[PDB]
């Protein structure tokens, strides 16, 4: 482990919805929430031994927090991840999650090329209980830690796949902080290279009396069970395949 290259620096973006609903129209409330959330997620990462031995101390730190206090004004037909209306259905509280991540990655491309990861924090009720999305760890899909260019034929420019998003709204209410911590952990988990834990591998998907599920389980975990705030051995194997190579590529020293 390289202590000079063990931290994935993050650009954290809070959109106007997150600012209004979670930050109560205040920057200090917005930033404190995000600073504490990343630090608790960092504790999970930093304490994980990816090889089940001494390969630990790998984590995350915020480089910058961008706070979008108001919606992004758009020209008719033009779209932006921070616009007032949801896309593609303006009548719905939320965007289609996949289109929102693509849009965020498009709009943040220049900034994203200079950071290990960009993560959007929003407050919108994604259809069917979805809480987040991220590139990487998907079973021709690519992305995750360290900017990787993708030429957008629609966008007509390179976008970077080092992105993810978390919503703190679900089924018409703010999720608990213990729940939000796990969304971000899961999404950054995909960014670090983990896929979802399968039911077919009991070691990676234990029963409730055996500590419950691990953070990469596809059905959301409310941190009440022992395993909820940990990575399965499946997640560790997947992340460990590339963690060191990615660390050499874009990770920095813990500030
Ligand atoms: C933190 C969780 C693990 C993230 C995943 C989404 C995901 O895998 N993105 O990486 C999620 O939102 N899962 C939902 C989920 O488990 N939501 C819970 C909160 C829920 O709404 N359950 C309601 C039962 N119908 C799905 C899409 C499975 C409904
Ligand atoms: Zn997932």
Pocket of ligand 1 (CB under 6 A): 128-134, 170, 182-183, 186-187, 190, 218-220
Return all residues near 106 (Cβ < 8 A) that are at least 6 apart.
81, 152, 155, 159
Count CA within 13 A, CB hemisphere, residue 197. Answer: 28
Helix (H) or strand (E) holding 47: helix 27-47
- Active site (annotated) includes residue 249: no
Distance of CA 187 from the midpoint of ligand 1 (Å): 11
Q: Whose CA is nearest to atom 29 of ligand 1?
A: 129
Report the nearest atom of ligand 1 relative to the CA of 217: 3
Strand order in the sheet with 7-14: 59-67, 7-14, 117-122, 163-167, 132-134
- Check whether 190 is labelled as a binding-site residue: yes
For residues 10 and 145, what is the distance between their CA atoms, to the nearest angstrom? 10
Residue from 220, 225, 231, 232 to probe ligand 1 pocket by mutation (most atoms less than 8 Å from CB): 220
Q: Structure tokens of 176?
A: 């608990």
If DSSP codes are grouped into helix, strand and coil, which group holds residue 72?
coil
Distance of CA 166 from the midpoint of ligand 1 (Å): 11
Q: What residue ranges define each of the domains in the chain, with the CATH number in brackets?
A: 1-255 (3.40.390.10)
Q: Whose CA is nearest to atom 2 of ligand 1?
A: 220
Strand partners, 64: 11
- Check whether 119 is labelled as a binding-site residue: no
Q: Whose CA is nearest to atom 10 of ligand 1?
A: 133
- Nominal resolution (angstroms): 1.8
List of E strands, the chain:
7-14, 59-67, 117-122, 132-134, 149-152, 157-160, 163-167, 169-170, 173-174
Distance of CA 49 from the midpoint of ligand 1 (Å): 26
Give me the sign of the Cα torsion angle 35, 121, 227, 171. Answer: positive
Contact at 8 Å (CB) between 246 and 194? no
Choosing from 63, 102, 179, 187, the catalytic residue is 187
Distance of CA 219 from the midpoint of ligand 2 (Å): 8
Q: Whose CA is nearest to atom 27 of ligand 1?
A: 130
Rounded to whole angstroms, what are the CA distances from 100 to 38, 156, 227? 22, 18, 30
């Amino acid at each position: 482990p390289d202590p000079m290259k063990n931290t994935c620096k993050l650009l954290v973006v809070a959109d106007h919805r997150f600012y209004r609903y979670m930050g109560r129209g205040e920057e200090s409330t917005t930033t404190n929430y995000l600073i504490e959330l990343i630090d608790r997620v960092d504790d999970i990462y930093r304490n994980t031994a990816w090889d089940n031995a001494g390969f630990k101390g790998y984590g995350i730190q915020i480089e910058q927090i961008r706070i979008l206090k108001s919606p992004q004004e758009v020209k008719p037909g033009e779209k932006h991840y921070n616009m007032a209306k949801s896309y593609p259905n303006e009548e719905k509280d939320a965007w289609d999650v996949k289109m929102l991540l693509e849009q965020f990655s498009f709009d943040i491309a220049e900034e994203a090329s200079k950071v290990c990861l960009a993560h959007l924090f929003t407050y919108q009720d994604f259809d069917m209980g979805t809480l987040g999305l991220a590139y990487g760890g998907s079973p021709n899909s690519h992305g995750g830690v360290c900017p990787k260019a993708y030429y957008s034929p629609v966008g007509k420019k390179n976008i970077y796949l080092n992105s993810g998003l978390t919503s703190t709204k679900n089924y018409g209410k703010t999720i608990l902080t213990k729940e939000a911590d796990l969304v971000t952990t899961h999404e950054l988990g995909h960014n670090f290279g983990a896929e979802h834990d399968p039911d077919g591998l009991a070691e990676c998907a234990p029963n409730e009396d055996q500590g419950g599920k691990y953070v990469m389980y596809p059905i959301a975990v409310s941190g009440d069970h022992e395993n909820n705030k940990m990575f399965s051995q499946c997640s560790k194997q997947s992340i460990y395949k590339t963690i060191e190579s990615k660390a050499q590529e874009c990770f920095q020293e813990r500030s």
